[PDB]
Structure 1
Amino acid sequence: RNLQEFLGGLSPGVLDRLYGHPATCLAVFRELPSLAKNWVMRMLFLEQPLPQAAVALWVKKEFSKAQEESTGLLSGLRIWHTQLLPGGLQGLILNPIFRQNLRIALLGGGKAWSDDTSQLGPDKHARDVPSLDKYAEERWEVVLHFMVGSPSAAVSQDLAQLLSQAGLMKSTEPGEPPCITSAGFQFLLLDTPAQLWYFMLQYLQTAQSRGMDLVEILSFLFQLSFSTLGKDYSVEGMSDSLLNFLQHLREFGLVFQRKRKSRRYYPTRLAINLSSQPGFIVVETNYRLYAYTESELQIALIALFSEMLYRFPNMVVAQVTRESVQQAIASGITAQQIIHFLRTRAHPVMLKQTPVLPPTITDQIRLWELERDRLRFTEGVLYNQFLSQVDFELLLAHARELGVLVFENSAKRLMVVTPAGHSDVKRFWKRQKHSS
């Protein structure tokens, strides 16, 4: 799921409380479509509602579908609310709180998002941007290795429980380590910003168990999203629970902090990328992958759907075979996920070509994917004992009404239904003959 889907199901009060922070409003505005942004900007400096027809006349008739979609999305997000214009007309005006916060974020005004940074002076143990990036990469690699099950990576108990609640890994028995499921493989194949966003969404969903304020967590996350890289921020000014949540972020690599009691925290590159690098995989027409990577995580991920051939100290040469792709699919990974992963990790050299990946390789992978699903199997019960067409039609209509029909053929008067509905169909058939 995406941000818009998550925000659609929230109550109006929660949405209004979210708009109280300028950082949240900017993120919501950037998540809007291109057409919606122009409407928001035009209505930013308006103190009076506008007629619905006047707004509808801005976009041409041919692109009315995009206008309708944008209007529906804005109404669902409650960015604007319809106003009862005098004379029976309907006026459209943006939410005053959202508009005020957006103007504060853009034009200026009010207090800063962070309390202060120069009160405590320069950090005694400050790090650099490459160090923060290395720390974030190490944390993410440790998390993903713990997802795989490598003993070298050990995380906190609550983090492991969160993965179990997310369904990526299941713990069949207490004490024994959980096993990664197909959903875990799909999560691994996802892009890093997508993985971070999915993990944050799962955290937000499970936050209701801990009784934490969703609005505060969302506002803090959005503030971290726009935070400048390499600049510390004041820990003070936050509730006790949020700091605890921040500690979990410290385990996730999004936020770096020297000590729990330290008053300085440095947002990392991964935290910035959460709101939204060059790729290290070269794909050749002969079904060969050349990866410029050294960490065991990427090697394992590539070996999930490919056969390894050579491992030079700074290079990995692998071959994409039919058997490897079939094994990966049997593991639960679809071809679309593999193609997306290859495109995301594609080397910058391959970006020169008009297609990111050669069409032949993608077509071959997709065809290999369809090989497993070529045969369709449906367990059920077949009825072929119809003496008359009229009797067959009534039973077929009853089965369709029950919604247990699998296959119908009026030409030969043969039908196939689910075993669960077989008892109901038999009871219906007996009643028709007995009552006759």
Structure 2
Amino acid sequence: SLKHSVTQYLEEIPQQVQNRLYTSPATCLAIYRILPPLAKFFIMAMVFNENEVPLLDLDKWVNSNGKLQFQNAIKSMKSLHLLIPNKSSGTLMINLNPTFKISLRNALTGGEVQNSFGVVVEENVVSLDLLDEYSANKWETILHFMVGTPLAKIPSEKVLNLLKHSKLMEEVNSTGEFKITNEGFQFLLQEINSQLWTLLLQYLKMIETMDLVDVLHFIFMLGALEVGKAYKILSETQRIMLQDMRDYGLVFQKHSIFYPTKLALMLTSDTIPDGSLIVETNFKIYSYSNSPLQIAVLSLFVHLKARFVNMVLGQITRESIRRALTNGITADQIIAYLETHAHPQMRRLAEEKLEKKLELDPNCKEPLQVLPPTVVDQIRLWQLELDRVITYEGSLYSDFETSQEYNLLSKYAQDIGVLLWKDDKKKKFFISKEGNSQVLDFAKR
């Protein structure tokens, strides 16, 4: 979903803006890496030759087996308008974007680049002691405040404004508090790479009147930078943007020179476990984690009982599950968290159980469930308990002069999908509040 999410955003941007977005090679070298392998293969072929190549020539390269991949590669390449289709002389000729072409040639052959990758002050700092600490703490603060755990130093209004304005962490003044939502637990369930892209993507949409291309000239360029080194200071919009980026633990500033951090390189490309936990049939939890982030997120749906330096022990209860569900966390996500953070011991025992099942009868292949099924069933049953009472807001229609009229109005409600219940014997039906006005208006006509 990582490359899909970034690519999807880059597709919606109008063509007139994409042409301007390729002026800086730093961005071109980043957009090039996100395309499918076949797309990169063809792009590299066209970059160095100043000619036009018919599409049929590209088709000839692909073998019969990989014909399907040739469809996705060309579609994704055309969506970003990198590849311009020009038809003339009865042939659908294919050419590469001149601005994209020049930028890539400059990047590979070391041509004039207009400081697209930045400069170096040659005043290095210690990466392990400061950069790792600074962004880890800065990224820790935003996630802790996200999870709802109490914390001393709350983040600045910039990210706070972004958090609320996003679907993440719904807030209400009447409630006076902030709580996580369905997408919120999903966000906390995503790897660091996607966890960072969600916030940056939301920031891109939030800004208004600061150019959209400049905010991308910085993020993609920020990937080109290497951790543990200085970069002297650029566009005017990139100054306030740089300070704004400083609140998400991406770039560290002593107070003239800014330093990217581990997360900065974590944006471009990819790259016992801490967080692994054991769940027993007694609805107990023992998490082999020493990190306040993991403990806080566990507290969303776990009743913590005590802690040691090496592990945390708690108990699953109806109160905790109800507390999580009320916030919009689905039971499917909870079991996903438990399964993907399972201890090796659970996996080994589950594998042995599967082996014995297949040993007696190898006909059927039962699914490999790492954690006991009773806990999953109980959690789902508690979700059903929340879903017991069903209520809709709407109106009841009655006292119809004629069966024809009752069927006419009720059938219309069914057609537009606003009918919730009907009874032919009583000539009554109930429709949702959303569709009331449409049904009333149709009744008059």
Q: TM-score, normalised by structure 2?
A: 0.77
The 1:39–1:322 alpha-carbon spacing in structure 2 relative to 1, beyond 3 Å, is farther
**1:306-317 equivalence runs, <5 A:** 306-317=302-313
Q: Hey, what does 2:358 align to over in structure 1?
A: none
Q: Hey, what does 1:194 align to over in structure 2?
A: 194
Query: Following TM superposition, by how much is the alpha carbon of 1:320 offset from its aligned partner in structure 2, in angstroms?
Result: 4.0
**1:11-410 equivalence runs, <5 A:** 11-56=14-59, 58-59=61-62, 66-87=69-90, 89-111=91-113, 113-117=116-120, 121-123=122-124, 126-147=125-146, 148=148, 150=150, 152-167=152-167, 168-170=169-171, 172=173, 178-182=177-181, 184-208=184-208, 211-235=209-233, 238-259=234-255, 262-263=256-257, 265-276=258-269, 279-284=273-278, 286=280, 289-321=285-317, 324-339=320-335, 341-342=337-338, 358=370, 360=372, 364=377, 367-368=380-381, 371=384, 372-373=386-387, 377-381=391-395, 394-400=408-414, 402-406=416-420
What per-residue deviation string (whole Å, max 9, x for no partner) do you get for residues 259-313 of structure 1? Answer: 1xx33x2211111112349841223362554434334332111111223243112
- Segments of structure 2 that go 5 or more residues without pairing to the other structure are 352-366
What CA distance in whole angstroms lies between the structure 2 residues aligned with 1:204 and 1:318? 40
Given that 1:225 and 1:274 are in contact with CA atoms closer than 8 Å, whether structure 2 keeps it comes out as: yes
Query: Following TM superposition, by how much is the alpha carbon of 1:82 offset from its aligned partner in structure 2, in angstroms?
Result: 0.7
Given that 1:56 and 1:67 are in contact with CA atoms closer than 8 Å, whether structure 2 keeps it comes out as: yes
Tell me the SS of whatever aligns to 2:307: strand
Given that 1:307 and 1:319 are in contact with CA atoms closer than 8 Å, whether structure 2 keeps it comes out as: yes
Given that 1:346 and 1:356 are in contact with CA atoms closer than 8 Å, whether structure 2 keeps it comes out as: no
What CA distance in whole angstroms lies between the structure 2 residues aligned with 1:374 and 1:64? 51
The 1:401–1:255 alpha-carbon spacing in structure 2 relative to 1, beyond 3 Å, is same
Given residue 250 of structure 1, which amino acid in structure 2 is its aligned partner? Answer: R
Q: Hey, what does 1:10 align to over in structure 2?
A: 13
Given that 1:350 and 1:357 are in contact with CA atoms closer than 8 Å, whether structure 2 keeps it comes out as: no
Given that 2:303 and 2:316 are in contact with CA atoms closer than 8 Å, whether structure 1 keeps it comes out as: yes
Relative to structure 2, which stretch is displaced further, 29-38 or 225-234? 29-38
The 1:429–1:267 alpha-carbon spacing in structure 2 relative to 1, beyond 3 Å, is closer
Q: TM-score, normalised by structure 1?
A: 0.79
The 1:422–1:256 alpha-carbon spacing in structure 2 relative to 1, beyond 3 Å, is closer
Q: Hey, what does 2:362 align to over in structure 1?
A: none
Query: Following TM superposition, by how much is the alpha carbon of 1:133 offset from its aligned partner in structure 2, in angstroms?
Result: 0.9
Query: Following TM superposition, by how much is the alpha carbon of 1:9 offset from its aligned partner in structure 2, in angstroms?
Result: 1.7
Given residue 196 of structure 2, which amino acid in structure 1 is its aligned partner? Answer: L
The 1:425–1:203 alpha-carbon spacing in structure 2 relative to 1, beyond 3 Å, is closer
What CA distance in whole angstroms lies between the structure 1 residues aligned with 2:95 and 2:379? 48
Tell me the SS of whatever aligns to 1:281: coil
Query: Following TM superposition, by how much is the alpha carbon of 1:95 offset from its aligned partner in structure 2, in angstroms?
Result: 1.4
Given that 1:26 and 1:102 are in contact with CA atoms closer than 8 Å, whether structure 2 keeps it comes out as: yes
Q: Hey, what does 1:417 align to over in structure 2?
A: 431
The 1:420–1:20 alpha-carbon spacing in structure 2 relative to 1, beyond 3 Å, is closer
Given that 2:274 and 2:290 are in contact with CA atoms closer than 8 Å, whether structure 1 keeps it comes out as: no
Query: Following TM superposition, by how much is the alpha carbon of 1:98 offset from its aligned partner in structure 2, in angstroms?
Result: 1.5
Given that 1:190 and 1:337 are in contact with CA atoms closer than 8 Å, whether structure 2 keeps it comes out as: no
Number of aligned residue pairs = 417
What per-residue deviation string (whole Å, max 9, x for no partner) do you get for residues 73-113 of structure 1? Answer: 222211211111322x2122221221332333344433454
What CA distance in whole angstroms lies between the structure 2 residues aligned with 1:225 and 1:365? 45
Q: Hey, what does 1:434 align to over in structure 2?
A: none
What CA distance in whole angstroms lies between the structure 1 residues aligned with 2:65 and 2:388? 41
Query: Following TM superposition, by how much is the alpha carbon of 1:169 offset from its aligned partner in structure 2, in angstroms?
Result: 4.5
What CA distance in whole angstroms lies between the structure 2 residues aligned with 1:64 and 1:385? 64
What CA distance in whole angstroms lies between the structure 1 residues aligned with 2:41 and 2:424? 56
Query: Following TM superposition, by how much is the alpha carbon of 1:356 offset from its aligned partner in structure 2, in angstroms?
Result: 10
Query: Following TM superposition, by how much is the alpha carbon of 1:347 offset from its aligned partner in structure 2, in angstroms?
Result: 6.4
What per-residue deviation string (whole Å, max 9, x for no partner) do you get for residues 178-229 of structure 1? Answer: 5235255554444333232111112212222xx3122122111112123222
- What is the RMSD computed on CA atoms of the aligned residues? 3.9
Given residue 264 of structure 2, which amino acid in structure 1 is its aligned partner? Answer: A
Query: Following TM superposition, by how much is the alpha carbon of 1:243 offset from its aligned partner in structure 2, in angstroms?
Result: 1.9
- Segments of structure 1 that go 5 or more residues without pairing to the other structure are 432-436
Given that 2:225 and 2:265 are in contact with CA atoms closer than 8 Å, whether structure 1 keeps it comes out as: yes
Relative to structure 2, which stretch is displaced further, 54-63 or 71-80? 54-63
The 1:149–1:292 alpha-carbon spacing in structure 2 relative to 1, beyond 3 Å, is closer
